[PDB]
Design an enzyme around this catalytic site. Structure first.
Site, PDB file in Angstrom:
ATOM      1  N   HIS A   1       0.790  -1.261   0.000  1.00  0.00           N
ATOM      2  CA  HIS A   1       0.000   0.000   0.000  1.00  0.00           C
ATOM      3  C   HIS A   1       0.807   1.288   0.000  1.00  0.00           C
ATOM      4  O   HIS A   1       0.155   2.306  -0.092  1.00  0.00           O
ATOM      5  CB  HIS A   1      -0.969   0.007   1.206  1.00  0.00           C
ATOM      6  CG  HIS A   1      -1.967  -1.089   1.115  1.00  0.00           C
ATOM      7  ND1 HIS A   1      -2.890  -1.220   0.100  1.00  0.00           N
ATOM      8  CD2 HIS A   1      -2.258  -2.091   1.966  1.00  0.00           C
ATOM      9  CE1 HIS A   1      -3.637  -2.276   0.278  1.00  0.00           C
ATOM     10  NE2 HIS A   1      -3.236  -2.852   1.433  1.00  0.00           N
TER      11      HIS A   1
ATOM     12  N   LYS B   1      -4.832  -9.805  -7.895  1.00  0.00           N
ATOM     13  CA  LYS B   1      -5.560  -9.145  -6.780  1.00  0.00           C
ATOM     14  C   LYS B   1      -6.569  -8.196  -7.417  1.00  0.00           C
ATOM     15  O   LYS B   1      -6.217  -7.373  -8.251  1.00  0.00           O
ATOM     16  CB  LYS B   1      -4.570  -8.405  -5.886  1.00  0.00           C
ATOM     17  CG  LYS B   1      -5.191  -7.748  -4.669  1.00  0.00           C
ATOM     18  CD  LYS B   1      -4.144  -7.158  -3.736  1.00  0.00           C
ATOM     19  CE  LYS B   1      -4.693  -6.879  -2.348  1.00  0.00           C
ATOM     20  NZ  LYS B   1      -5.196  -5.500  -2.191  1.00  0.00           N
TER      21      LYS B   1
ATOM     22  N   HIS C   1      -3.370  -2.783   7.605  1.00  0.00           N
ATOM     23  CA  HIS C   1      -4.452  -3.049   6.629  1.00  0.00           C
ATOM     24  C   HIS C   1      -5.008  -1.747   6.083  1.00  0.00           C
ATOM     25  O   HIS C   1      -5.088  -0.750   6.831  1.00  0.00           O
ATOM     26  CB  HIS C   1      -5.533  -3.851   7.362  1.00  0.00           C
ATOM     27  CG  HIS C   1      -6.842  -3.973   6.684  1.00  0.00           C
ATOM     28  ND1 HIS C   1      -7.164  -5.070   5.917  1.00  0.00           N
ATOM     29  CD2 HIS C   1      -7.953  -3.188   6.730  1.00  0.00           C
ATOM     30  CE1 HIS C   1      -8.413  -4.944   5.504  1.00  0.00           C
ATOM     31  NE2 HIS C   1      -8.900  -3.783   5.986  1.00  0.00           N
ATOM     32  N   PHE C   2      -5.276  -1.714   4.783  1.00  0.00           N
ATOM     33  CA  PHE C   2      -5.950  -0.578   4.147  1.00  0.00           C
ATOM     34  C   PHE C   2      -7.436  -0.888   4.029  1.00  0.00           C
ATOM     35  O   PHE C   2      -7.804  -1.817   3.347  1.00  0.00           O
ATOM     36  CB  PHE C   2      -5.382  -0.301   2.757  1.00  0.00           C
ATOM     37  CG  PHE C   2      -5.820   1.035   2.219  1.00  0.00           C
ATOM     38  CD1 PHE C   2      -7.001   1.123   1.486  1.00  0.00           C
ATOM     39  CD2 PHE C   2      -5.047   2.173   2.433  1.00  0.00           C
ATOM     40  CE1 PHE C   2      -7.418   2.363   1.007  1.00  0.00           C
ATOM     41  CE2 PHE C   2      -5.476   3.406   1.945  1.00  0.00           C
ATOM     42  CZ  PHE C   2      -6.651   3.472   1.262  1.00  0.00           C
ATOM     43  N   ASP C   3      -8.306  -0.192   4.736  1.00  0.00           N
ATOM     44  CA  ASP C   3      -9.742  -0.529   4.740  1.00  0.00           C
ATOM     45  C   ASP C   3     -10.516   0.164   3.642  1.00  0.00           C
ATOM     46  O   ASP C   3     -11.453  -0.472   3.168  1.00  0.00           O
ATOM     47  CB  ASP C   3     -10.356  -0.226   6.126  1.00  0.00           C
ATOM     48  CG  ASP C   3     -11.514  -1.157   6.460  1.00  0.00           C
ATOM     49  OD1 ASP C   3     -11.361  -2.377   6.194  1.00  0.00           O
ATOM     50  OD2 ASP C   3     -12.476  -0.694   7.064  1.00  0.00           O
TER      51      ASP C   3
END
EC number: 4.6.1.18
Length: 124
Positions: free
Chosen positions: A12, A41, A119-121
């Protein structure tokens, strides 16, 4: 043994470009960051801010995570990001993506000591 912090940085972070730059960017970066190794992905976001500025989000606006956990945080400022989205024609292993640039608030999930993004939400 990739750490959760390092996995977030690989998937990210891209502080080197100010904004998606090129129509080629998602095709190159999804491959070079190893996000097309096992499958294409389908979507992924890269953030074009300093690591310190993204790490600082873990002490910003606490918001619910999409999974219902409580450890998500929204940036008070907008950030330069690039959204990558697999094209309808994309077939593994020749994963193909549309590159779109945006300036939005990011939402990250944070864990650990030190408390850092894992984590990228979402972007909003």
């Amino acid at each position: 043994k990739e750490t959760a912090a390092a996995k977030f940085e690989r998937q990210h972070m891209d502080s080197s470009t100010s904004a998606a730059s090129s129509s080629n960017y998602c095709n190159q970066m999804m491959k070079s960051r190893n996000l097309t190794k096992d499958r294409c992905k389908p979507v992924n976001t890269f953030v074009h801010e300093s690591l310190a500025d993204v790490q600082a989000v873990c002490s910003q606006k606490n918001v619910a995570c999409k999974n219902g956990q409580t450890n998500c945080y929204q940036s008070y400022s907008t950030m330069s990001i690039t959204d990558c989205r697999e094209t309808g024609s994309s077939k593994y292993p020749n994963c193909a993506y549309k590159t779109t640039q945006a300036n939005k608030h990011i939402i990250v999930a944070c864990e650990g000591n030190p408390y850092v993004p894992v984590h990228f939400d979402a972007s909003v």
